[PDB]
Amino acid sequence: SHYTDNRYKMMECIKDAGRPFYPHKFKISMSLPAYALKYGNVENGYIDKDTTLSLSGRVTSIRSSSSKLIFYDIFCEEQKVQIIANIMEHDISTGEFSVSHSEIRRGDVVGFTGFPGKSKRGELSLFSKSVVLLSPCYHMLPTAISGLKDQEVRYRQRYLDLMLNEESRKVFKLRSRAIKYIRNYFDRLGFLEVETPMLNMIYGGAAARPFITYHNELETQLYMRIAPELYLKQLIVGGLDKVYEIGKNFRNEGIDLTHNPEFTAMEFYMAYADYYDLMDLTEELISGLVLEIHGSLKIPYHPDGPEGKCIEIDFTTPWKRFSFVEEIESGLGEKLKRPLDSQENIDFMVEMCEKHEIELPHPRTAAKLLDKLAGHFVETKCTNPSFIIDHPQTMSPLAKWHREKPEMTERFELFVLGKELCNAYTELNEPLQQRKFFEQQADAKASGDVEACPIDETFCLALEHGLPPTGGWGLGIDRLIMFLADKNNIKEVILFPAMRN
Amino acid sequence: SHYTDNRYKMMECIKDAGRPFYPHKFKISMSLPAYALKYGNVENGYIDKDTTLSLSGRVTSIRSSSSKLIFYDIFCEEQKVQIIANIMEHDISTGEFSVSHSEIRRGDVVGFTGFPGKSKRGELSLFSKSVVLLSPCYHMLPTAIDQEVRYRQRYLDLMLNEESRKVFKLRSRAIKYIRNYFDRLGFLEVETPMLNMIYGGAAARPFITYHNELETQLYMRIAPELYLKQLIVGGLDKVYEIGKNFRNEGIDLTHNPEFTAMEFYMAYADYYDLMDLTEELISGLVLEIHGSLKIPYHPDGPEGKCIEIDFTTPWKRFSFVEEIESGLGEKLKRPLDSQENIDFMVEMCEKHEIELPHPRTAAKLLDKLAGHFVETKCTNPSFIIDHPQTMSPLAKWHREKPEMTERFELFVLGKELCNAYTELNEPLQQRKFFEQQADAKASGDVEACPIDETFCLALEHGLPPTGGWGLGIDRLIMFLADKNNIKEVILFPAMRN
Numbered sequence: 001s002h003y004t005d006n007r008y009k010m011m012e013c014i015k016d017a018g019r020p021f022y023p024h025k026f027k028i029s030m031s032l033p034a035y036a037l038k039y040g041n042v043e044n045g046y047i048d049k050d051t052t053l054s055l056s057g058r059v060t061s062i063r064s065s066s067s068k069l070i071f072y073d074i075f076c077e078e079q080k081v082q083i084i085a086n087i088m089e090h091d092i093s094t095g096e097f098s099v100s101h102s103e104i105r106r107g108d109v110v111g112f113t114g115f116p117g118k119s120k121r122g123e124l125s126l127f128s129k130s131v132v133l134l135s136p137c138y139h140m141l142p143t144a145i146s147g148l149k150d151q152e153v154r155y156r157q158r159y160l161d162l163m164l165n166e167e168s169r170k171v172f173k174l175r176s177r178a179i180k181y182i183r184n185y186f187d188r189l190g191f192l193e194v195e196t197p198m199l200n201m202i203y204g205g206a207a208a209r210p211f212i213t214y215h216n217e218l219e220t221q222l223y224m225r226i227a228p229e230l231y232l233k234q235l236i237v238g239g240l241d242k243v244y245e246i247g248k249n250f251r252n253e254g255i256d257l258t259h260n261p262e263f264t265a266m267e268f269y270m271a272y273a274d275y276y277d278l279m280d281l282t283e284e285l286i287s288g289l290v291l292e293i294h295g296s297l298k299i300p301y302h303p304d305g306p307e308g309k310c311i312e313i314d315f316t317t318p319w320k321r322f323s324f325v326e327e328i329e330s331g332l333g334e335k336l337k338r339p340l341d342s343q344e345n346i347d348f349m350v351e352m353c354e355k356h357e358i359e360l361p362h363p364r365t366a367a368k369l370l371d372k373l374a375g376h377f378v379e380t381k382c383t384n385p386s387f388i389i390d391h392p393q394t395m396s397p398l399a400k401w402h403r404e405k406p407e408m409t410e411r412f413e414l415f416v417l418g419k420e421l422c423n424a425y426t427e428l429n430e431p432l433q434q435r436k437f438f439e440q441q442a443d444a445k446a447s448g449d450v451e452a453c454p455i456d457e458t459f460c461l462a463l464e465h466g467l468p469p470t471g472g473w474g475l476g477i478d479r480l481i482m483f484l485a486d487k488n489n490i491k492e493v494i495l496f497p498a499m500r501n
Numbered sequence: 502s503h504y505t506d507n508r509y510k511m512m513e514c515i516k517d518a519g520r521p522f523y524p525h526k527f528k529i530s531m532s533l534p535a536y537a538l539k540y541g542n543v544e545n546g547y548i549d550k551d552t553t554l555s556l557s558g559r560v561t562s563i564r565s566s567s568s569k570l571i572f573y574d575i576f577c578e579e580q581k582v583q584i585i586a587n588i589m590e591h592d593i594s595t596g597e598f599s600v601s602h603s604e605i606r607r608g609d610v611v612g613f614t615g616f617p618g619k620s621k622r623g624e625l626s627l628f629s630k631s632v633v634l635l636s637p638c639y640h641m642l643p644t645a646i647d648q649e650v651r652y653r654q655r656y657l658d659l660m661l662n663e664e665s666r667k668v669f670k671l672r673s674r675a676i677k678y679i680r681n682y683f684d685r686l687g688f689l690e691v692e693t694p695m696l697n698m699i700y701g702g703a704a705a706r707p708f709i710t711y712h713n714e715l716e717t718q719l720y721m722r723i724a725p726e727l728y729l730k731q732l733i734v735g736g737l738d739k740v741y742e743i744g745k746n747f748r749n750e751g752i753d754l755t756h757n758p759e760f761t762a763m764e765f766y767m768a769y770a771d772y773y774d775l776m777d778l779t780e781e782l783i784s785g786l787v788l789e790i791h792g793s794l795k796i797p798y799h800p801d802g803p804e805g806k807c808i809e810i811d812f813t814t815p816w817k818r819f820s821f822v823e824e825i826e827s828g829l830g831e832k833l834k835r836p837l838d839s840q841e842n843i844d845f846m847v848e849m850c851e852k853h854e855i856e857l858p859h860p861r862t863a864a865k866l867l868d869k870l871a872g873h874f875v876e877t878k879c880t881n882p883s884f885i886i887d888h889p890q891t892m893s894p895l896a897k898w899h900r901e902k903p904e905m906t907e908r909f910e911l912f913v914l915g916k917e918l919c920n921a922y923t924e925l926n927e928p929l930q931q932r933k934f935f936e937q938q939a940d941a942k943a944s945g946d947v948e949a950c951p952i953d954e955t956f957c958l959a960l961e962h963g964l965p966p967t968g969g970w971g972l973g974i975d976r977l978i979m980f981l982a983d984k985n986n987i988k989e990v991i992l993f994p995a996m997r998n
């Protein structure tokens with residue numbers, strides 16, 4: 001592009017002519033938002049020639065109306081301000097007027113000094129005496145994201161999206177706001193926020209394939225964590241009673257509209273809670289947060305982008321419960337075989353998948369087949385926030401056996417519009433069973449289940465020191481933002497999402 | 502261990518007799534802190550047989566004073582309560598008195614139900630009618646805190662040693678204060694990728710991993726710097742991030758392979774602004790935690806000697822090259838990255854018995870000299886300033902000093918806490934300095950970073966004048982909590998073997 005080349009040449013001409021080249025420090029008098037706050041309500045034509053002020057931002061517009069007069073718009077911290085540069089007011093010690101302004105291009109980061117007020121037409125303005133080129137833009141910028149080459153430019157060059165698209169900036173402010181609300185909710189309950197390792201000698205705490213790496217000096221392989229669950233429960237053994245953690249998990253899996261290989265999760269562990277308590281807390285936290293952002297519990301959503309239809313999500317509590325096995329059997333019209341992990345039920349579930357054209361998982365463990373059946377018959381019923389509850393033990397190796405239902409656990413997942421938001425349970429705190437389920441996990445992994453975890457002996461030893469009855473819970477922060485901010489693509493709520501190619 | 506095997510045998514006998522086996526839910530009437538608050542003032546010997554309460558904690562002591570009377574201490578949420586179990590009050594529907602209590606051991610997590618009050622001797626007590634085993638402990642616990650056990654079994658350290666719990670509460674309080682400092686300034690907290698196609702932003706060897714679906718090698722981030730600056734190009738003006746970095750390097754008293762760093766980027770700041778902010782932020786936090794700017798520190802552990810660290814402002818500044826030349830009694834050769842000065846710095850390291858770096862780049866030699874001559878003088882919080890450009894590939898050239906940059910490091914007791922600078926925002930130079938890093942890496946420098954074209958393209962869209970800054974949260978907690986081992990401030994630190 002000839003434009004980038006010429007700009008470099010211009011900057012070389014500036015630097016070798018002794019003129020301002022990338023000044024180190026520009027001292028603004030106030031922000032542009034502060035400027036609009038102080039001066040936005042003056043009368044049209046008002047100017048305070050007794051006050052000199054320095055302002056800075058990115059040039060979004062240049063218009064020379066005459067040989068004597070140049071109009072700029074600059075933008076900074078969500079505020080636009082017009083600069084009126086009149087040759088009569090020009091500080092000639094900064095160079096001749098026409099030379100000073102010939103160095104400026106739309107998109108440049110620049111400073112101005114001048115008198116505050118309002119043009120006779122009512123535009124909030126600075127009547128400038130000087131202009132300083134702080135940081136030039138070397139590329140021709142479009143006017144909006146609509147002028148970009150493709151819309152993947154928004155994700156690969158996020159600075160362009162943030163520069164040109166106010167809706168993108170709003171998303172990441174909302175994301176911060178929601179996380180603040182969430183922290184405050186648990187801080188007020190007396191929780192302690194902790195950090196537990198993202199480098200693990202043994203990965204665990206979820207059904208997910210890990211990233212593998214290696215520590216040279218300790219001569220050992222490590223896994224990026226797929227979940228903090230196993231460390232956090234050890235803190236409850238240690239007596240901290242209420243802990244939470246907000247941070248990244250790493251899952252070496254495919255990317256789609258609701259999966260990024262790193263994502264932000266919150267987990268908390270509350271001694272003496274069970275999953276009934278956790279269901280009530282989930283409803284209270286999420287509906288409070290929805291109310292905080294939206295002013296009611298019925299919020300809009302565009303499932304096919306904003307050129308599509310607009311639906312309503314109703315967060316009114318209490319939310320519907322679906323029982324895992326019962327809702328599958330209602331969809332099938334017959335019962336699963338018992339025990340659920342028998343070879344007989346495994347064969348039956350295979351024949352049910354092929355009957356209902358459900359893509360088989362690999363390998364064909366009972367847990368993975370149950371999950372496929374659930375995704376087909378149950379998760380698709382979850383339009384408004386719904387709990388899917390009481391998952392079979394065989395697919396929940398860390399959830400405590402259900403106090404009433406054989407073969408099930410005290411577990412729930414929260415689903416919104418068929419997408420999973422939360423995973424939670426009464427915690428398994430019995431070491432014999434826990435060891436047994438770890439062995440079954442290790443067996444599945446050895447059979448090719450890349451989402452099954454190895455046995456963690458350190459964790460079994462911790463349970464032998466006595467984990468109090470405890471309730472635990474995990475939430476996908478990014479997926480929460482998708483719903484709060486009305487995005488159907490997770491790449492909209494992560495600043496630098498993973499991209500192919 | 503016979504004790505562990507025997508406890509498994511007890512729990513099977515319990516399960517097979519239909520007796521309580523890991524109850525799913527125990528509803529406490531109130532917490533032990535709440536119980537202490539409500540009844541801790543009643544007269545001695547007082548008892549309210551009209552009020553029945555349920556309490557739970559971990560058993561810390563069992564005294565079976567007679568066949569009819571058993572005293573327990575339970576502990577939960579930092580509060581101890583005594584349980585007085587008299588056979589005449591026992592709910593025999595839960596088992597005969599002797600059978601119910603034969604199932605409990607020290608260290609078990611248990612619940613009790615009974616009447617509130619105070620023993621005649623004046624101890625806050627529950628006069629219990631029942632006991633329920635909630636989660637047994639299968640191991641004999643010591644009265645008190647190898648001491649490497651504290652780090653490999655952190656739950657035992659927390660269970661038994663209040664000081665360990667105090668540290669991690671202090672850590673939380675400190676991070677809260679820091680978030681609040683920047684939130685009130687209008688900063689926006691952000692999250693940038695920990696998996697990187699290209700590592701950069703620091704001098705460190707990365708961890709290497711691999712994403713199978715995309716068939717691409719990846720690095721874990723050594724720092725978020727390059728992404729965060731892209732956010733200032735995007736116009737967010739004031740951002741910060743608090744999270745893990747990953748560095749594939751040796752562990753010692755101040756290094757863990759993952760650690761918690763805070764970085765922030767402030768449009769229109771330079772490094773003099775950032776020095777003033779560092780002073781205000783840190784001294785205010787020290788004063789908040791300690792009630793003065795002079796605090797104790799034990800460099801050789803708690804039984805060793807105790808010194809005083811003084812955070813009174815303004816803090817000392819040391820100029821990087823000038824202080825080295827003071828220590829040498831002679832001047833470095835110019836330019837500092839010429840082969841002549843590289844050879845001269847090698848001579849100076851041999852003369853002063855400073856171990857040589859590999860490879861022997863100007864930058865790493867300069868670092869070794871500074872480590873010997875300048876970092877050692879930083880007892881109280883001190884800024885080392887104006888690093889040569891050759892060791893500062895992302896820092897903007899000094900407005901006055903040739904070959905130097907507008908950079909500082911904060912040191913405390915000879916340990917690095919902060920690294921900050923006026924950000925380089927001129928793309929031509931930045932490309933040149935990335936090319937020199939790539940050359941160093943190709944010559945064997947495993948801490949030099951490859952060229953990141955996506956960052957250079959970002960700078961061509963115009964990065965405002967900006968000041969940026971990183972802090973090692975863990976190392977800060979070390980001084981605030983008076984620990985000389987980074988393993989004391991990280992819940993699950995990395996361990997050898």
Ligand SMILES: NCCCC[C@H](N)C(=O)NS(=O)(=O)OC[C@H]1O[C@@H](n2cnc3c(N)ncnc32)[C@H](O)[C@@H]1O
Pocket residue numbers: 205206207226227228229251258259260261262263264265267420421422423424425427472473474475476477478479
């Ligand atoms: N002891 C109770 C269980 C706690 C949570 C458990 N350790 C766990 O990790 N569950 S999870 O369901 O695998 O992850 C929690 C949430 O993370 C979200 N998640 C999972 N994978 C991804 C990906 N790849 N991107 C984004 N969000 C994701 C989703 O909302 C899940 O409900």
Ligand SMILES: NCCCC[C@H](N)C(=O)NS(=O)(=O)OC[C@H]1O[C@@H](n2cnc3c(N)ncnc32)[C@H](O)[C@@H]1O
Pocket residue numbers: 702703704723724725726748755756757758759760761762764895917918919920921922924969970971972973974975976
């Ligand atoms: N643009 C301004 C520069 C910002 C910081 C820069 N990106 C950076 O990473 N500097 S750093 O010095 O490499 O890391 C910041 C701090 O992290 C701390 N640190 C570094 N390595 C470790 C390790 N290994 N463990 C613990 N703490 C560590 C130490 O306090 C450093 O001052």
Ligand SMILES: [Cl-]
Pocket residue numbers: 805806807808
């Ligand atoms: Cl002393």
Ligand code: NA
Pocket residue numbers: 316317318
């Ligand atoms: Na309700």
